[PDB]
């Protein structure tokens, strides 16, 4: 037990704008554009996409927004949800 | 028409390729114009021509004789340059060794080479090649060249300079007009590159004055044809001071203009200087590099207003990207765990871009030294607009610590004393220290081992040991019978990133028997309360000590073996716990630092001074083996081992558990039998050493390598004495109770670092003669 | 360290066999001190009246009488960006009476008129003042080694005729005196560019060049050559940077023809008699004949200074090591008799007022005659 | 370097080659070649001297000469031999050590030369599915792939050691499309579900638990 | 670099004839994934050559004049 730690963070750097903008059907072209390189989908299974962020400093708190996405085989923004801050 | 055609004297090309090379063949009416065609084709072969064409009847012989081959090497007259550089200036020039070498080529290449001499800015008068043909087809040339060397015959001239004195400006130059050499800090020589440099230098200077408009300037370098007229002038035309009044940005940015105005924080009525503005530019770029956008672009358009010298400022910035990092790849762990390599890291594969952070990890490495190469190659995946990927190629340097031991003695066994203190152990980072001495009277064990790594914190336990049987008896007794068993292990853990804190525990046994005639020993015995003898060499003692061992150290080390501008400190201390066989109070503190006066840092200066102080806790004193010793060492050279120090007198020792004959003089039976002043460097309970030198890789060493030969010229200072010292028993004897033991020594330190061991030649001329100076101006260490 | 160049040095002193023993020595010295610094400074004999100086902003009027001192003035200026602002003086020597004309490397020229006194009217010239100044027809003539060429007026200065020549990049050492004639002047260049302003606007009649010089097909490091041609009979002859004879016969205009010959130093003409030293430091003589020569020489190759003059039927050439070598009863007799100084010498020798005039590298003058 | 003609110098070359004075063998080799760099004997000595480099372990010279020839003669019968020896050189580069001589504590260094040997031998075996070396070079390649699987295994092991769950997962997917054949592959699979838990990657986790139960033996 | 060795065994151990072969892994019903991404391809038609260290590693010579 050390009293404190350096903070740790992970990908999917976004804004509340970055969620308020997009919506259903929006093509993966537009979405991967306006939201950036999507860094989380399944190598096997549906066109389901994920945006997750976390930050853990010095033994305190949790900042876990976990945005799940799907497209269809064609690619349609569809079946979307985030769970923010864990 | 011909029916047969035969060639010879080729040695290089088949008859088929040769016949298909020249235009004529068999099966066509060979007429005179075909003969001229052979003539002109041989001429036009370009690498070889010799037209000897005779068609008598129906037979055709086309004969081209070959100046090839040749193997000319004899680069003679190489007096300032290497012959291989000459070979380069052939091959890289296009005079490579594929050698046909028509006789014409001699003057052409000689003279293009002399051209290269001028390219140096230099000259060489004779350049001659001498045909030595080898009678297979080969030749060699005696390449004799006498030099016309011309490097610095400078002469400064400046025109248009009327807002300042030329010389104010000259000062900061690299290109200098042959000043007395003892002022040298850096370099002074000519080169067209030196030109371009100094040019830009003062350009920049003048414009960052606030002075704006000057840019017009042409080269005029007067050259008296002596190799020596180096007389150099350039036109200029001063521009306009402006006041910095007005700044504005064009933020094509994700939104940081708050932080921007925060940064481009400009006072009214300011005066312009390109310095601060270049700065602010850079500053903003850095503020954003952490933000991932590794690719902006700015044009700072200063609204130069005349009649007010207003440089209103307009800049314009474009955004970059957020997140790339996708691969963290290294080059060089040929026999190495890259585990530790990633241990020195803090940035993460898989986030957005603070380039600074990979930079931090790298420079952290480079602080660790042990390797010589920079590499941060950050490649972005073609086929994805993001996902740049940093690469790291560094060239390590080995460490092997070995010494060989055989002899040399007269009445004692062939010595096998071992120095092997190995480190960063090739497959790991782990380090071991073993100094095993087995010399015919002395079997002193030594262990000191440590893992750099136990945790993600990287903590380290120092497994360390010694076991010393130091007797060095005359026969078996009255000669300090001793055993000493000292055990200790230590951990250190900092979180200050530069300041280590050490705290460890140590045990030692120490055995005594057959005390000696040093009165201070008996005196310490009485300090403990132990009644020892005074004329008998019979006194014994054993101890088993429980002392705490705590340390600290500051660290900012620019390199490894040759760190620059070192800023690094050590704290060290020992204290005894309840339940031990010792009590004392001893402090010791050492310091070493650098300053490179060169900023190419070819010239650094050492700042090194150390401190050591010991006394006792309640009722007791600092034990004797814990005293500070010095002389003829790499803190003070010119003496013999630990020769500087106080000198202990002797009590009359005559009934001394066989006080020997012809042996142990200074108050023995055979010798004088009364009180005896003995000359014996005992070392004091307090020490502090200062030493100074200068880093200069001399031009007289072939500095074709800059990290294995080291060149020093040192001076030092010292005085060491007893603090718990009196004259009641040193009335007629010398007194050591203050800093009084001054010795001085100046000397050169001669070092070339070969991986296996250092050749430590050391002459120091010890000149501040304090009593007990037993000098040795040669200590050849390894 | 930098001297392991074991070159063939000065071809040794020849004999001093000379009926003509150096007889006079009227001494006088500025004590300075020119040293290694390179320019044309040279005694001015204005009606046997001399005016001496050195490279510090100095004056002293003398007299070809054994040289008594007058007008001893110092010109280095005390206020401004510095105290006395060291005057360093690379200018050729010319006057019009006491209207003494010269500028220095400082790109600033003083035409003091020590006939009406300290008439220290000045102009900070475009380009820099190095060559020997030439006054033609109420105008002053300018070869600033700047690629520029001006014209101004005497006792006043007035910038005009602003001519630009072109330069070789390596920044060679050719400074040049214009030889004025026919509303034109005959000056030299270093790119070999041969041009001749008929002084109309600054109007050359010219685009040709000497193709043989230094800078791209550079030549060796001793090709010192006088860059100042002279018209005779309308016929001008050229002294190219590299050893290259050329005769551009100016017939109120440009007529050109190169009778090329190597080894260029500096020249004199005697009707048809062309006397000259070859850049080997050897003296050839020639005629207007297409370049047919006479007068071999080798005894003084690489003898440092070879700076010529003639009077008394005596070919007299200045050298370093302060000697005198007397040609005379001309060829084949070339031999000397003198070693005058240790300072050596650098500049043109002046045989003026029938007399002999020269500065010493250190100190002014020790007037010696046959 | 005496001046024995290619005959004598070459014979003594064979003497010290089959003899095993590979250093002096190379001395006489270069004697002949620098004396006579022309001819089919010159090319034969080229091949036998790349052999002798590999014998004397002259890997800088070895790689130098072998690539000099590969660009030099890009058309040959022994191209199989050439790819063979060159991949072999990549190996020898990548695996020269003391603990490797002990055969212990290895496979955690720069596998770049392993990558080189792999590319080489693959080019060989598919450009030449038909050679004395084809089965052999195949054994090479499979060994190398397996070794790497292990190496990178250790690597991302270190990641998750430091906790680089993401970086781990990424290396996983990498080898997944690369070569999920070796033991290290299935071996690493559980660590995937570990990271899942670390990040609470639930559905993916139990899905891969199912699929590994199908794959795990 | 030989010590009466270095002809018919690799430097150190060889694991070729010691190689752990391919693991054809069984995916559940419909659980397939991209089989390959690169060089991962072998022409099985070959051999059996002088497999292991039983092959003339010396240069196969050629006739000379």
Whether residue B232 is found in the same domain as residue B367 = no
Resolution of the model in angstroms: 8.0
Of all residues in chain D, the one with the smallest CA distance to A68 is D201
Cα separation, B735 vs B435, whole angstroms: 35
Q: Give the SS3 label for residue D64.
A: helix
Query: Which of these, B497, B488, B431, lies nearest to B460 by C-alpha position?
Result: B431
**What is the Rg, in whole angstroms, of the alpha carbon atoms belonging to chain E?**
19
Would you call A9 an interface residue with chain D, using a CB distance cutoff of 8 Å?
no
Tokens found for residue D163: 């906790």
Contacts 24+ apart (CB under 8 A), D127-132: D127/D79, D127/D83, D128/D79, D128/D80, D128/D83, D129/E43, D129/E45, D129/E46, D130/E45, D130/E46, D131/D80, D131/E46, D131/E49, D132/D80, D132/E49, D132/E50, D132/E55, D132/E56
Annotated domain spans of chain A: 9-86
Calculate the dihedral angle through the C-alpha atoms of B673, B676, B681, B684, rounding to the nearest 10 degrees: 130
- Closest CA–CA distance from residue D130 to any residue of chain B (Å): 34
Cα separation, B467 vs B484, whole angstroms: 6
Residues B764 and B385 sit within 8 Å (Cβ to Cβ):
no
Q: How distant, in Å, are the alpha carbons of B9, C27, C86, C364 from that of C31?
A: 74, 11, 18, 6
Q: How distant, in Å, are the alpha carbons of C43, C128, C151 from that of C110?
A: 18, 13, 15
**Experimental technique behind these coordinates:** cryo-EM
Touch between chain B and chain E (3+ CB pairs, < 8 Å)?
Answer: no
Task: Name residues whose C-beta falls within 8 Å of residue C313's C-beta, 6 or more positions apart in sequence.
Answer: C328, C329, C330
Cα separation, B105 vs B111, whole angstroms: 10
Per the CB < 8 Å rule, is B225 touching C222?
Answer: yes
Tokens found for residue B53: 């064409």
Residues C319 and C326 sit within 8 Å (Cβ to Cβ):
no
Cα separation, B600 vs B565, whole angstroms: 12
Tokens found for residue C296: 């071999």
| Interface mutation vs chain D, best among E39, E54, E61, most D CBs within 10 Å | E39
CA D56 to chain centre: 18
Provide the domain limits for residue C345.
Answer: 4-370
Whether residue B597 is found in the same domain as residue B613 = yes
Residues B353 and B321 sit within 8 Å (Cβ to Cβ):
yes
**Helices assigned H by DSSP within B579-672:** none
Cα separation, D175 vs D172, whole angstroms: 5
Residues D114 and D91 sit within 8 Å (Cβ to Cβ):
yes
Tokens found for residue C54: 């050195």
Cα separation, B305 vs B245, whole angstroms: 10
Give me the residues of D, 112-131, that contact B with CB < 8 A.
112
| H-helix or E-strand spanning residue A50 | strand A47-53
CA B597 to chain centre: 15
CB-based burial label for B255 (10 Å; 0-12, 13-18, 19+): exposed
Cα separation, B260 vs B256, whole angstroms: 6
**Residue for token digits 């309308």?**
C234
Number of domains in chain C: 1
| Interface mutation vs chain B, best among D91, D102, D108, most B CBs within 10 Å | D108
Whether residue B520 is found in the same domain as residue B426 = yes
- Closest CA–CA distance from residue A11 to any residue of chain B (Å): 5
Q: How distant, in Å, are the alpha carbons of B593, D42, D46 from that of D39?
A: 64, 5, 11
Query: Which of these, B621, B663, B622, B627, lies nearest to B642 by C-alpha position?
Result: B627
**Helices assigned H by DSSP within C192-238:** none
DSSP track, D14-26: HHHHHHT-HHHHH
Touch between chain C and chain B (3+ CB pairs, < 8 Å)?
Answer: yes
* Cross-chain CB nearest to C172 (options B118, B159, B223): B223
Query: Rounded to the nearest 10 degrees, what angle do helices D79-94 and D59-72 cross at?
Result: 150
Query: Which of these, B568, B521, B560, lies nearest to B540 by C-alpha position?
Result: B521
Tokens found for residue C136: 């033609």
* Cross-chain CB nearest to A43 (options D163, D176, D199): D176
Cα separation, C234 vs B308, whole angstroms: 59
Would you call A45 an interface residue with chain E, using a CB distance cutoff of 8 Å?
no
> What order do you get walking across the sheet with C307-311 strand by strand?
C307-311, C314-318, C324-327
Domain boundary at B264, B287, B321, which? B321
Tokens found for residue A27: 């093509």
Whether residue B141 is found in the same domain as residue B157 = no
DSSP letter, residue B518:
B
Would you call C224 an interface residue with chain B, using a CB distance cutoff of 8 Å?
yes
| CATH code for residues A9-86 | 3.30.1450.10
Beta bridge partners of B312: B303
Number of domains in chain B: 6
Cα separation, C167 vs C143, whole angstroms: 12
Residues B651 and B522 sit within 8 Å (Cβ to Cβ):
yes
| Strand duo B418-420 + B4-6: pairing | unpaired
Whether residue B278 is found in the same domain as residue B372 = no
Whether residue B231 is found in the same domain as residue B247 = no
Task: Name residues whose C-beta falls within 8 Å of residue B216's C-beta, 6 or more positions apart in sequence.
Answer: B235, B236, B237
Would you call C107 an interface residue with chain B, using a CB distance cutoff of 8 Å?
yes
User: Where residue D176 sits, what CATH number does that domain have?
Assistant: 1.25.40.10
Tokens found for residue B182: 């003892």
Cα separation, B541 vs B482, whole angstroms: 9
Tokens found for residue C171: 């920044």
What are the φ/ψ torsions at residue B43 (nearest 5 degrees)?
-55, -45
Query: Which of these, B246, B238, B249, lies nearest to B303 by C-alpha position?
Result: B246
| Sign, Cα dihedral of B5, B6, B11, B14 | positive
User: Where residue B39 sits, what CATH number does that domain have?
Assistant: 3.10.20.310
Task: Name residues whose C-beta falls within 8 Å of residue E5's C-beta, 6 or more positions apart in sequence.
Answer: none
- Closest CA–CA distance from residue E57 to any residue of chain A (Å): 44
What would you measure as the largest C-alpha separation in chain E, in angstroms? 67
Cα separation, D195 vs D205, whole angstroms: 9
Task: Name residues whose C-beta falls within 8 Å of residue B636's C-beta, 6 or more positions apart in sequence.
Answer: B630, B644, B689, B691, B716, B718, B743, B745, B764, B766
CB-based burial label for E26 (10 Å; 0-12, 13-18, 19+): exposed
Q: Give the SS3 label for residue D145.
A: helix
Query: Which of these, B562, B563, B566, lies nearest to B553 by C-alpha position?
Result: B566
| Strand duo B327-331 + B377-380: pairing | unpaired
Query: Which of these, B54, B48, B47, B43, lies nearest to B6 by C-alpha position?
Result: B54
Residues A39 and A12 sit within 8 Å (Cβ to Cβ):
yes
Tokens found for residue C231: 């018209």
Query: Which of these, D56, D58, D87, lies nearest to D70 by C-alpha position?
Result: D87
Give me the residues of C, 173-212, that contact B with CB < 8 A.
173
Provide the domain limits for residue B124.
Answer: 67-149
Helix, strand and coil content of chain B, in percent to the nearest 5, comes to: 15, 30, 55
């Amino acid at each position: 037990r050390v009293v404190y730690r350096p903070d740790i963070n992970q990908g999917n750097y976004l804004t509340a704008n970055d969620v308020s903008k997009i919506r259903v059907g929006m093509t993966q072209q537009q979405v991967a554009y306006a939201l950036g390189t999507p860094l989380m989908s399944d190598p096997f299974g549906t066109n389901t996409w994920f945006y997750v962020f976390r930050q853990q400093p010095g033994h305190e708190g949790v900042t876990q927004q976990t945005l799940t996405l799907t497209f269809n085989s064609s690619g349609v923004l569809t079946n979307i949800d985030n769970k923010p801050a864990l | 028409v011909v029916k047969d055609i035969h060639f010879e004297g080729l040695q290089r090309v088949a008859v088929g390729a040769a016949l298909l090379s020249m235009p004529v063949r068999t099966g066509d009416t060979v007429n005179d114009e075909d003969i001229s065609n052979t003539i002109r084709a041989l001429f036009a072969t370009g690498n070889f021509e010799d037209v000897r064409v005779l068609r008598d009847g129906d037979t055709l012989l086309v004969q081209v004789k070959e100046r090839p081959t040749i193997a000319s090497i004899t680069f003679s007259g190489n007096k300032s340059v290497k012959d291989d550089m000459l070979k380069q200036n052939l091959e890289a020039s296009g005079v490579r060794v594929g050698e046909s070498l028509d006789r014409t080529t001699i003057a052409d290449i000689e003279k293009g080479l002399e051209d290269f001499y001028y390219s140096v800015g230099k000259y060489s008068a004779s350049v001659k090649a001498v045909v030595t043909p080898l009678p297979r087809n080969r030749v060699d040339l005696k390449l004799v060249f006498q030099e016309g060397v011309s490097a610095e015959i400078q002469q400064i001239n400046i025109v248009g300079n009327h807002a300042f004195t030329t010389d104010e400006l000259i000062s900061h130059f690299q290109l200098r007009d042959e000043v007395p050499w003892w002022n040298v800090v850096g370099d002074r020589k000519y080169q067209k590159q030196k030109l371009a440099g100094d040019l830009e230098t003062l350009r920049s200077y003048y414009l960052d004055r606030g002075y704006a408009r000057f840019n017009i300037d042409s080269t005029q370098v007067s050259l008296t044809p002596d190799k020596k007229g180096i007389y150099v002038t350039v036109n200029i035309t001063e521009g306009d001071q402006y006041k910095l009044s007005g700044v504005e940005v064009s933020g094509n940015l994700a939104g940081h203009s708050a932080e921007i105005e925060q940064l481009t924080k400009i006072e009214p009525g300011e005066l312009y200087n390109g310095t601060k503005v270049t700065k602010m530019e850079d500053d903003i770029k850095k503020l954003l590099g952490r933000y991932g956008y590794a690719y902006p672009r700015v044009q700072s358009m200063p609204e130069i207003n005349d009649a007010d010298k207003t440089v209103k400022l307009r800049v314009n910035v474009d955004a970059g990207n957020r997140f790339y990092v996708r691969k963290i790849r290294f080059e060089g762990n040929d026999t190495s765990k890259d585990a530790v390599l990633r241990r020195e890291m803090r940035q993460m594969e898989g986030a957005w871009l603070g380039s600074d952070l990979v930079d931090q990890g790298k420079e952290r490495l480079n602080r660790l030294g042990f390797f010589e190469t920079v590499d941060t190659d950050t490649q972005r995946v073609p086929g994805s607009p993001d996902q740049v990927d940093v690469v790291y190629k560094v060239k390590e340097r080995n460490t092997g610590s070995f010494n060989f031991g055989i002899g040399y003695g007269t009445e004692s066994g062939v010595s096998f004393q071992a120095g092997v203190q190995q480190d960063n152990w090739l497959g790991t980072g782990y380090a071991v220290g073993i100094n095993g001495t087995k010399n015919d009277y002395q079997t002193y064990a030594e262990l000191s081992v440590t893992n750099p790594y136990f945790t993600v914190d990287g903590v380290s336990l120092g497994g360390r040991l010694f076991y010393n049987d130091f007797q060095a008896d005359d026969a078996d007794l009255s000669d300090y019978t001793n055993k000493s068993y000292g055990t200790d292990v230590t951990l250190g853990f900092p979180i200050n990133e530069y300041n280590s804190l050490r705290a460890g525990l140590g045990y030692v046994h120490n055995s005594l028997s057959n005390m000696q005639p040093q009165v201070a020993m008996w005196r310490y015995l009485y300090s403990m309360g132990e009644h020892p003898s005074t004329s008998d060499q019979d006194n014994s003692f054993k101890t088993d000590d429980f002392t705490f061992n705590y340390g600290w150290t500051y660290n900012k080390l620019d390199r490894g073996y040759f760190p620059t501008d070192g800023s690094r400190v050590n704290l060290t201390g020992k204290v005894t716990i309840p339940g031990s066989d010792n009590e004392y109070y001893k402090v010791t503190l050492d310091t070493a630092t650098y300053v490179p006066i060169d900023d190419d840092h070819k010239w650094v200066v050492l700042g090194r001074t150390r401190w050591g102080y010991g006394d006792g806790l309640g009722g007791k004193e600092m034990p004797f083996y814990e005293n500070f010793y010095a002389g003829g060492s790499s803190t003070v050279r010119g003496f013999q081992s630990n020769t500087i120090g106080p000198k202990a007198v002797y009590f009359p020792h005559q009934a001394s558990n066989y006080d020997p004959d012809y042996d142990y003089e200074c108050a023995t039976q055979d010798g004088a039998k009364d009180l005896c002043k003995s000359d014996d460097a005992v070392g004091g309970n307090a020490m502090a050493v200062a030493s100074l030198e200068f880093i200069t890789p001399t031009p007289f060493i072939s500095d074709k390598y800059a990290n294995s030969v080291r060149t020093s010229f040192f001076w030092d200072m010292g005085t060491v004495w007893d603090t718990n010292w009196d004259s009641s028993q040193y009335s007629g004897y010398p007194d050591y109770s203050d800093p009084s033991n001054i010795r001085m020594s100046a000397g050169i330190a001669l070092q070339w670092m070969s991986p296996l061991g250092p050749l430590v030649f050391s002459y120091a001329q010890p000149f501040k003669k304090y009593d007990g100076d037993k000098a040795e101006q040669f200590q050849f260490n390894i | 360290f930098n001297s392991e160049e074991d070159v063939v040095k000065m071809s040794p002193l020849p004999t001093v066999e000379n009926q003509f023993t150096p007889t006079t020595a009227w001494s006088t010295s500025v004590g300075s001190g020119i040293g290694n610094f390179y320019s044309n400074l040279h005694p001015a004999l204005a009606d046997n009246v001399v005016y001496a100086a050195d490279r510090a902003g100095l004056v002293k009027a003398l007299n070809a009488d054994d040289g008594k001192e007058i007008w001893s003035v110092s010109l280095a200026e005390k206020d401004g960006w510095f105290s006395k602002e060291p005057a360093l003086l690379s200018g050729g020597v010319t006057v019009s009476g006491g209207h003494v004309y010269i500028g220095s490397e400082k790109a600033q020229v003083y035409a003091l008129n020590t006939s009406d006194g300290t008439v220290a009217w000045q102009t900070k010239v475009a380009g820099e003042a190095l060559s020997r100044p030439v006054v033609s027809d109420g105008l002053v003539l300018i070869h600033t080694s700047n690629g520029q060429l001006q014209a101004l007026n005497e006792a006043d200065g007035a910038v005009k005729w602003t001519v630009n020549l072109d330069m070789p990049s390596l920044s060679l050492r050719g400074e040049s005196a214009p030889t004025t004639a026919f509303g034109a002047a005959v000056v030299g260049g270093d790119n070999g560019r041969v041009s001749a302003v008929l002084m109309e606007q600054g109007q050359m009649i010219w685009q040709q060049r000497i193709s043989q010089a230094t800078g791209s097909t550079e030549i060796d490091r001793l090709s010192d050559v006088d860059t100042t041609p002279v018209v005779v009979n309308g016929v001008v002859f050229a002294l190219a940077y590299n050893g290259n004879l050329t005769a551009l016969d100016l017939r109120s205009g440009q007529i050109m023809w190169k009778r090329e010959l190597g080894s260029v130093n500096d020249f004199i003409v005697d009707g048809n008699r062309i006397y000259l030293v070859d850049q080997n430091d050897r003296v050839m003589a020639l005629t207007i004949d297409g370049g047919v020569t006479l007068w071999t020489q080798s005894d003084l190759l690489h003898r440092l200074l070879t700076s010529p003059v003639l009077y008394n039927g005596n070919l007299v050439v200045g050298d370093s090591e302060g000697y005198l070598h007397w040609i005379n009863v001309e060829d084949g007799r070339f031999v000397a008799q003198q070693k005058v100084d240790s300072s050596g010498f650098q500049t043109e020798p002046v045989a003026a007022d029938g007399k002999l005039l020269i500065q010493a590298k250190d100190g002014t003058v020790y007037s010696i005659t046959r | 370097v005496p001046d024995n003609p290619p005959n004598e110098i070459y014979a003594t070359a064979q003497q010290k080659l089959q003899d095993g004075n590979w250093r002096q063998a190379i001395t006489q080799l270069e004697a002949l070649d620098n004396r006579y760099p022309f001819g089919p004997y010159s090319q034969q000595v080229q091949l036998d001297l790349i052999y002798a480099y590999y014998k004397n372990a002259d890997l800088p010279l070895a790689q130098a000469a072998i690539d000099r020839f590969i660009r030099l003669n890009p058309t040959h019968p022994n191209i199989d031999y050439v790819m063979y020896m060159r991949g072999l050189t990549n190996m020898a580069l990548d695996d020269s050590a003391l603990q490797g001589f002990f055969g212990v504590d290895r496979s955690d260094r720069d596998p770049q030369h392993a990558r080189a040997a792999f590319s080489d031998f693959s080019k060989l075996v598919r450009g030449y599915p038909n050679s004395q070396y084809t089965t052999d070079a195949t054994k090479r390649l499979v060994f190398l792939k397996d070794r790497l699987a292990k190496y990178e295994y250790s690597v991302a092991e270190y990641y998750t050691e430091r906790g680089a769950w993401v970086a781990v997962v990424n290396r996983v997917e990498g080898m997944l499309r690369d070569y999920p054949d070796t033991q290290a592959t299935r071996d690493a699979l559980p660590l995937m579900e570990n990271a899942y838990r670390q990040m609470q990657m639930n559905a993916q986790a139990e899905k891969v638990a199912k699929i590994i139960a199908a794959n795990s033996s | 670099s030989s010590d009466s060795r270095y002809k018919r065994q690799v430097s150190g151990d060889e694991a070729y004839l010691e190689a752990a072969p391919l693991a054809e892994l069984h995916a559940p019903a419909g659980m397939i994934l991209p089989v390959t991404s690169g060089d991962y391809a072998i022409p099985v038609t070959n051999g059996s050559g002088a497999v292991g260290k039983a092959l003339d590693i010396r240069p196969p010579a050629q006739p000379l004049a």
